[PDB]
Structure formats: structure tokens, C-alpha cells
Design a protein around this ligand. Structure first.
Ligand SMILES: *[C@@H]1O[C@H](CO[C@@H]2O[C@@H](C)[C@@H](O)[C@@H](O)[C@@H]2O)[C@@H](O[C@@H]2O[C@H](CO)[C@@H](O)[C@H](O)[C@H]2NC(C)=O)[C@H](O)[C@H]1NC(C)=O
Ligand code: NAG
Ligand code: NAG
Ligand code: NAG
Ligand code: NAG
Ligand code: NAG
Ligand code: NAG
Ligand code: ZN
Lengths: 596, 195
């Protein structure tokens, strides 16, 4: 019995005792998301506790068929998934303390309360309140007040407890046999064993830093244009020679620049395809919206949705009789059960979100034949890329003209197509440098390259070099600004979004080239193209059974990641930006403080 | 015709597990496959060795009845030349089979919201299954090289596992009631057939 015929079996019993327990937890979670009651919480707790106990028992029993003697890259990925001492390598008096740290951070972040330097009654929390005050306000002092108040009350009470998280998590990383906790998170991008497709853990460090170079010229021009358009909004507040205050970006932490469209609209006085009026005019409902989408995915050759989706999936808000969490989510309960939970309204945004979640179910359905442990995306940046390429395909005016949402003339003049490019760029181009900055900071605030006393002196120096923002008022060392973000306060990897963004455009260009599309890439609809659907499916099917390198190559033909596809998507906007930036200044000086 | 219980087999309150596999000798009246084509649409009607209508007009020496319920995606494994969990470790069909396979969904009858764990199938076997042969036994199966003494644990496993049917399962996992019929010839004179 080679340890390859004592691990072939073990996994056969795991695949059957895991499906039932995962299905029962998924059903309990779905029931709680249907009714928010007291019994449903108890059912969720029981199911989750049983599932976690089974996982822990199987993980403990696993480690027993050593790694070095298996030879079947597949029976070995499953062992990698099961053999893994996360937070069980620590002493019993340390794991509880770490869990207390995470629980305290989550509680502090969720129960935020700024209050006013005046009437001690109003105590605006995060959502809503602060998110609203940063979204639809044009004052300067008020936004500065909110920005400083959130990071003053919340920031101080989160570092003494972050400084102790950066010790225990690192020590655990040294125990499970890893270099560092950042190296722990850069682990799903690690592939070993197959010749010609390897990807070292430190290789991503170089790949990201090499891809952000071929972006600087576009982001720099976009930043210059945004600064020029923001001059008139805040006259005596921004200098042309250098950066933009970090509290004037329409988003609380600067993650997205979407709320600046109303201030930086290009050729305005020309609306964007909004078919919401036609929705009310032609009596459209959620069932018809989801029917329309099954029709898009049956055009590209991919399959229909089982009757179980139609019978067991809530699509409209029940009302005041029930309490449900209105949040678009695609559910894969397993054992042939697929559901989508969303409170649908007659809008174009919900029309696109339906396609997004429907693409999520088609991926999930694609790899249903794989073993339990491999039923996931190739990495953390493929599941959200084909949920968003379909939104781009559906948003095209040609697709909307083929289903009866626009009058069949709708002259596709170049005046209004550029307003769509800039708005679409304010959520893609404006978030990649922020993600790279945050991930680089977190990565080196672990390898010990930034000693504690310098945690918040390097941060505001990185945000003046990599991105174009500057703090409004000085922050001493006792603050902790990154912990104000949702992902930093919790334990979530943040580099997945950069990879998602750079993979979605590669997939889009590959599919459009496979569809014999002629013209600009942003005018591409992948409907009525069987070849494109077949090419995507040959990637959607594998899941984790093969390295993500081969999965990417099966569609784009490239061995690794690339930023060229995304700069080809933005060529007209880039040329126009160069055209209107001749009289302006491109670039920034890392020395203009909105506080001397 | 004497009306063999072709309506007591294809009509019962409860069947047996995948690994038991009951067997009545029927062979007592005139074949009445007309009702077989009736009684709800079928997921598969895959007679190998004869043709439907062609039947109700052939003298068979003995027609053995065999009954069990399996999941949807595993219905295709009841066929010659097929390798699978059911084929290798439960009921086997010979490569020279001649008969009919009748399967239809039974979600309303053999499913419960909590779960139906009364139907059992074997997963591991220290050898393969010969044609038309049963094997009932709970003897623990040893994976490693340390004998176990019939106790669960390290590289030690209990064979037969439970299904756990639920009404919300997909088409491939919903219960599918399957009846497979047998057709062999013997030196005895043929009497069990229609005029
Ligand atoms: C996708 O194709 C359908 C079906 O069109 C047929 O198949 C095409 C590949 C091509 O060969 C057509 O000539 C075929 O008729 C389109 O649905 C039709 O669209 C036309 C648009 O002029 C309309 O007149 C028909 O009534 C439609 N037929 C229907 C709805 O049953 C569909 O528009 C195509 N999608 C696009 C172009 O985005
Ligand atoms: C890996 O194991 C599976 C299951 O035993 C087997 O089917 C497969 O052929 C193996 N991979 C190869 C090609 O060695
Ligand atoms: C898919 O769904 C559409 C609309 O529900 C239906 O008309 C069509 O027959 C289905 N096609 C297949 C192959 O299931
Ligand atoms: C759009 O096309 C016109 C016609 O050639 C051209 O003059 C103009 O510069 C282009 N740009 C816009 C959007 O005005
Ligand atoms: C809550 O709502 C679900 C869905 O309609 C229903 O099936 C269930 O019986 C309800 N439970 C309670 C708490 O009444
Ligand atoms: C962690 O679990 C035990 C703890 O002693 C150890 O023997 C085992 O090798 C470790 N698992 C790993 C690092 O794969
Ligand atoms: C037996 O029960 C089945 C299932 O309800 C029914 O369709 C059939 O007519 C019955 N016939 C008998 C009594 O054999
Ligand atoms: Zn999504």
C-alpha cells in the first residue's frame, strides 16, 4: 500500500463525509438568510460547529501520509488543502488570545461612533452617515472633520491591539514552516512540481512591481486630469505642482474614484445609456430579467439553469412579513443545488448584477465533477473576473439594441462613448495603485523592514510616491490609519483585486479576438459566438485540478499576467487625455502639504 | 394470461439498498410490457439485446426482476462495459447482457427534508465484483498493513455509506428508482410467453 494507496482511500471517505456536512451548513445559512430569527441562528451555530469539528479532526488525522512520497499532482493538492496547521500550532493560551484580538477588532470596527465636537447627542456611525457624508458632500472643512474624526476615535483604539496581532500571526507563520505571514498569504499563487509552469512565492513580488510600471503613464494622466477638474471645485485648496488631499476623493479611504464623475464629467450634456425608464414603460420584472440572462449564456454555448434554481431561489424582497439580508450573492450549496439571493428592483444596475451572479453560477456549475477540495477557482482572482466580463459584454449598446431597450437608431456617436470610458476608468485605474501600495506596506510591515516607530511615517511617504494623495493634518506615531479599512481590521487578503482587474481584460480581449470582433475592444459583445463560449468553458471546467498558469494559457495564450490588454481597452481615452493635457502639468511633487 | 405480479415488483412501498438487490423469479404469465411504457416518463429506456415494441412477442425462459434506487448521475453505470463505483463494487452487468433497464424519478417518495439514510451502498472493496453476484458483509476494510481486529480508526474503514437524500437536491442526486430485467435461455421447454 504505497502512501499513494492510503491517501487515495482517505480522500474517498473525506469526499463523502464532507458533502453532507457542507450541505447541511449551507442549508442552515440559507435558512438564516431567509428568516433572521432566533432558531435559525442556533441551527447555523450547530451546523458550523459540527463542520469545523469534522474539519479539525480530518486535518489532525491527515498529516500521516508524508508529502514527499506522493506522486499524482491532484492527490497532492488535496493533501495540501487538508494537511495545514493554521492556528493549531500555537499553545492553548495563545490561540484564544488571538481570537480575542480578532473579535475585539471586528467589534470596534463595526460599532464605530464619531460624535460631534458639539451637541453630544448626534453620534453618526459608519454605514450610513460617514459613508454618506463622504459620498455626496462638496464642503471642505466638513469632510476634513469626518476624515480626521473617524481615524482619531477608531484609529487610536485599534493599534495597541494590531501591534499584538503582528506578533502572534508572524510567530504562527514561523511555526507552520513559512518564512513570514506575508509569505503565508502569497501561497495560493505558488505552484510546484509541473515542469515549465512553476511560479515562486517571491515571483509575484517582482511581477506586480513590473506590471505597475506599464500603468504609470495612464494613471499619471488621469490624475492630472482629475486634479485640473478639481481645481474649480476647491479653488484655494489644491496646487497644480503636486498631490490631491486624501479627503476629497468621494470615497472614505480613496479605494474608488466613482463619486467624482459628477465633478469630472467630460463632454457632459450628453446622458449615458440608462434604460430604467424603458423598464417601467415595457413592464419588466425580475423573472424576465433572469430569463433574458439565461438567454445570453445559452447563446455562447453554455448550459441552461435547473428547475431547482427557478423553484428554490428568492428573487424579490418578500416585504415586511419576513426579514432577509438584501445582498446579491450566488449560492453553491452543493449536490446539484444552485441559488441566487438578491432583492431585485427594476434598474440597469440590478440587470448587470443579475448577469454577474449568473456568471458566478455558470462557473460553479462548470467544475461540479471535480473532487470536493478542488471545487474552487484556479486562484483568488479568477472567480470574480468571469462575473465581470459578462457585465461588460451586456452593457454594450449593441446588446441592449438587440433585446428592445433602446430605440433602434441610437446613433453611436463618439461624443458619448468617451463619457463611459472615463466613468469606467474611475473604478479600475484609480484602485490599482491603492491596492499595490496597501499590499506592499502590509508585506514589508511583517518582514521587519519597517520597525514599529516608523509604521505611519513610511505609509504617508508611500502614498505621496506611489499614489497622488497627501494627509490633510500631521499624524504622529500613535495613530493607525490603515486599520480604519474593513480589510485591514479583519483578516482578508487584499492583492486579489489587482489580479482580478488585470485578468478580466486579458479574458475579454481573448474572447473578443476569438469572436472575430472588428473595431475597438470596448464595443465587443460576445453573444452569438460558440467559439468564445467553448474557449471559456475549457478553462471554467478544470478549477484547481491544474495550475492557474495552464488555465490562463488555455484562454489568453500567455504564460503569466499582462497589463497590455487593459491599456488597449483604454486607448481612445488615453489619446484624448494626452490631447487635453498639453496645457496642463503631468506628474506630482512629493512635498506639498495641505498644512505647510 | 395469469398477470404475474409485474405490478407488485414495479409497485411496492419500499425497495432495498444498492448492495442488497432483491430478485423475484416472475416467469409465470404472459408479458405485458404495455404498462411498462406507461407509468410516467422515464429517464432512460435502454434495452440491450431486444427492442421495446418488438417484445410482448418473444418467448423467454426466465425473466428475473431486480430492484434498487440510486442517484441520477449514476443511472448510466448499469450497463455492460462500464466502470464505476456502483459497477465495480455493487451490482455488475455482464458484457453480453440482454435485457431492459427501467428508471424513473422518485423524489416525492424516497426523500425527506431532514435526510433519508435508509439506503446504503458500498464504497471500498478489497477486490472486484463478478457478474450477477451479491456480497453482504460489514467486515471492516483495512487500508494500511496493520490488521485492525474489527475496530474503526487509523487506516481502518467501515464499508457501506449512507446516501442522505433531500428534496432540494439536483437532478443528478435525486433518487431514481431503477428496475432492471433479465433474459436467459435454458434447455427447459419455453412455456412462459404469450401465444
Ligand atoms: C443573436 O442571434 C439571434 C438570432 O439571429 C439568428 O442567428 C444569427 C446568428 C444570424 O444568423 C441571424 O441572421 C439569425 O436570424 C438574434 O435574434 C434576432 O435578431 C434580429 C436582429 O435584426 C431580429 O430581427 C430577430 O427578430 C431576432 N430573432 C429572435 C429574437 O428570435 C439576436 O439579436 C442576436 N444577438 C445580437 C445580435 O446581439
Ligand atoms: C491521479 O489519481 C487519479 C485517481 O486515482 C487517477 O485517475 C489519475 O490517473 C492520476 N493521475 C495520473 C495521470 O497519474
Ligand atoms: C433554456 O431556457 C429557455 C428559456 O427558459 C428555454 O426556452 C430553452 O428551451 C432552454 N434550453 C435548453 C437546452 O434547456
Ligand atoms: C469625435 O468625432 C468628431 C468627428 O470627426 C471629431 O471632430 C471629434 O474630435 C471627436 N471627438 C469628440 C468626442 O468630439
Ligand atoms: C420563514 O420563512 C421561510 C420562507 O418562506 C418559511 O419556509 C419558514 O417556515 C419561516 N420560518 C418561520 C420562523 O416562521
Ligand atoms: C503541525 O502539526 C504537528 C504538530 O506537532 C506536526 O507534527 C506537523 O508536522 C505539522 N504539520 C505541518 C506543518 O504540515
Ligand atoms: C401501485 O402504486 C403506484 C404508485 O402510486 C400506482 O401508480 C399504481 O397504479 C399502483 N398499482 C398497483 C396497485 O399495483
Ligand atoms: Zn461577484
Amino acid at each position: 500500500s504505497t502512501i499513494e494507496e492510503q491517501a487515495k482511500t482517505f480522500l474517498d471517505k473525506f469526499n463523502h463525509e464532507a458533502e453532507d456536512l457542507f450541505y447541511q451548513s449551507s442549508l442552515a445559512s440559507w435558512n438564516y438568510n431567509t428568516n433572521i430569527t432566533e432558531e435559525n441562528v442556533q441551527n447555523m451555530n450547530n451546523a458550523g460547529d459540527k463542520w469545523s469539528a469534522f474539519l479539525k479532526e480530518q486535518s489532525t488525522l491527515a498529516q500521516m501520509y508524508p508529502l514527499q512520497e506522493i506522486q499524482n499532482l491532484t492527490v497532492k493538492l488535496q493533501l495540501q488543502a487538508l494537511q495545514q496547521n493554521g492556528s493549531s500550532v500555537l499553545s492553548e493560551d495563545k490561540s484564544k488570545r488571538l481570537n480575542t484580538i480578532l473579535n475585539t477588532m471586528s467589534t470596534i470596527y463595526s460599532t464605530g461612533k464619531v460624535c460631534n465636537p458639539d451637541n453630544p447627542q448626534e453620534c453618526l456611525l459608519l454605514e450610513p452617515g460617514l459613508n454618506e457624508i463622504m459620498a455626496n458632500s462638496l464642503d471642505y472643512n466638513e469632510r476634513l472633520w469626518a476624515w480626521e474624526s473617524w481615524r482619531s476615535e477608531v484609529g487610536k483604539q485599534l493599534r495597541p491591539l494590531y501591534e499584538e496581532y503582528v506578533v502572534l500571526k508572524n510567530e504562527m507563520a514561523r511555526a507552520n514552516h513559512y518564512e513570514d505571514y506575508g509569505d503565508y498569504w502569497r501561497g495560493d499563487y505558488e505552484v510546484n512540481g509541473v515542469d515549465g509552469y512553476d511560479y515562486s512565492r517571491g515571483q509575484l513580488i517582482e511581477d506586480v512591481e513590473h506590471t505597475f510600471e506599464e500603468i504609470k503613464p495612464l494613471y499619471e494622466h488621469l490624475h492630472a486630469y482629475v486634479r485640473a477638474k478639481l481645481m474649480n471645485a476647491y479653488p484655494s485648496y489644491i496646487s497644480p505642482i503636486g498631490c490631491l488631499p486624501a479627503h476629497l476623493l468621494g470615497d472614505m479611504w480613496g479605494r474608488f474614484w466613482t463619486n467624482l464623475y459628477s465633478l469630472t464629467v467630460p463632454f457632459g450634456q450628453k446622458p449615458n445609456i440608462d434604460v430604467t425608464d424603458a423598464m417601467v414603460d415595457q413592464a419588466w420584472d425580475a423573472q424576465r430579467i433572469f430569463k433574458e440572462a439565461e438567454k445570453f449564456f445559452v447563446s455562447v454555448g453554455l448550459p441552461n439553469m435547473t428547475q431547482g434554481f427557478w423553484e428554490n431561489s428568492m428573487l424579490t424582497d418578500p416585504g415586511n412579513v419576513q426579514k432577509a439580508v438584501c445582498h446579491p450573492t450566488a449560492w453553491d450549496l452543493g449536490k446539484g443545488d444552485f441559488r441566487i439571493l438578491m432583492c431585485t428592483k427594476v434598474t440597469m444596475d440590478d440587470f448587470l448584477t443579475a448577469h454577474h451572479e449568473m456568471g458566478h453560477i455558470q462557473y460553479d456549475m462548470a467544475y461540479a465533477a471535480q473532487p470536493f477540495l478542488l471545487r474552487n477557482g484556479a486562484n483568488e482572482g479568477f472567480h470574480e473576473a468571469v462575473g465581470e466580463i459578462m457585465s461588460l459584454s451586456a452593457a454594450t449598446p449593441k446588446h441592449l439594441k438587440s433585446i428592445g431597450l433602446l430605440s433602434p437608431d441610437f446613433q453611436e456617436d463618439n461624443e458619448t462613448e468617451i463619457n463611459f470610458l472615463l466613468k469606467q476608468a474611475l473604478t479600475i485605474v484609480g484602485t490599482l495603485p491603492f491596492t499595490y501600495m496597501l499590499e506592499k506596506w502590509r508585506w514589508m510591515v511583517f518582514k521587519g523592514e519597517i520597525p514599529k516607530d516608523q509604521w505611519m511615517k513610511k505609509w504617508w511617504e508611500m502614498k505621496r510616491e506611489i499614489v497622488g494623495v497627501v494627509e490633510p493634518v500631521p499624524h504622529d506615531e500613535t495613530y493607525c490609519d490603515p486599520a480604519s479599512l474593513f480589510h485591514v481590521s479583519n483578516d482578508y487578503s487584499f492583492i486579489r483585486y489587482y489580479t482580478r482587474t488585470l485578468y478580466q481584460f486579458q479574458f475579454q480581449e481573448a474572447l473578443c479576438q476569438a469572436a472575430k470582433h472588428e473595431g475597438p475592444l470596448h464595443k465587443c459583445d460576445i453573444s452569438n459566438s460558440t467559439e468564445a463560449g467553448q474557449k471559456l468553458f475549457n478553462m471554467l471546467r478544470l478549477g484547481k485540478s491544474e495550475p492557474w498558469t495552464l488555465a490562463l494559457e488555455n484562454v489568453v495564450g500567455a504564460k503569466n499576467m499582462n497589463v497590455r490588454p487593459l491599456l488597449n481597452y483604454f486607448e481612445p481615452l488615453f489619446t484624448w487625455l494626452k490631447d487635453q493635457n498639453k496645457n496642463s502639468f503631468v506628474g506630482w511633487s512629493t512635498d506639498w502639504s495641505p498644512y505647510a | 394470461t395469469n398477470l404475474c405480479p409485474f405490478h407488485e415488483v414495479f409497485n411496492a412501498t419500499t425497495f432495498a439498498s444498492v448492495y442488497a438487490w432483491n430478485r423475484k423469479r416472475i416467469s409465470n404469465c404472459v408479458a405485458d410490457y404495455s404498462v411498462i411504457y406507461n407509468f410516467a416518463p422515464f429517464f432512460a429506456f435502454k434495452c440491450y439485446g431486444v427492442s421495446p415494441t418488438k417484445l410482448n412477442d418473444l418467448c423467454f425462459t426466465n425473466v428475473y426482476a431486480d430492484s434498487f434506487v440510486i442517484r441520477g448521475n449514476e443511472v448510466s453505470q448499469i450497463a455492460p462495459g462500464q466502470t464505476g463505483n456502483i459497477a465495480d463494487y455493487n451490482y455488475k452487468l455482464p458484457d453480453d447482457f440482454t435485457g431492459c433497464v427501467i428508471a424513473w424519478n422518485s423524489n416525492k417518495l424516497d426523500s425527506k427534508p431532514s435526510g433519508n439514510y435508509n439506503y446504503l451502498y458500498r464504497l471500498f472493496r478489497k477486490s472486484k465484483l463478478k457478474p450477477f453476484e451479491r456480497d453482504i458483509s460489514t467486515e471492516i476494510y483495512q487500508a494500511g498493513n496493520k490488521p485492525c481486529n474489527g475496530v474503526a480508526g487509523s487506516n481502518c474503514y467501515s464499508p457501506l455509506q449512507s446516501y442522505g437524500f433531500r428534496p432540494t437536491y439536483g437532478v443528478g442526486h435525486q433518487p431514481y428508482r431503477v428496475v432492471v430485467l433479465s433474459f436467459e435461455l435454458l434447455h427447459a421447454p419455453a412455456t412462459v410467453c404469450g401465444p
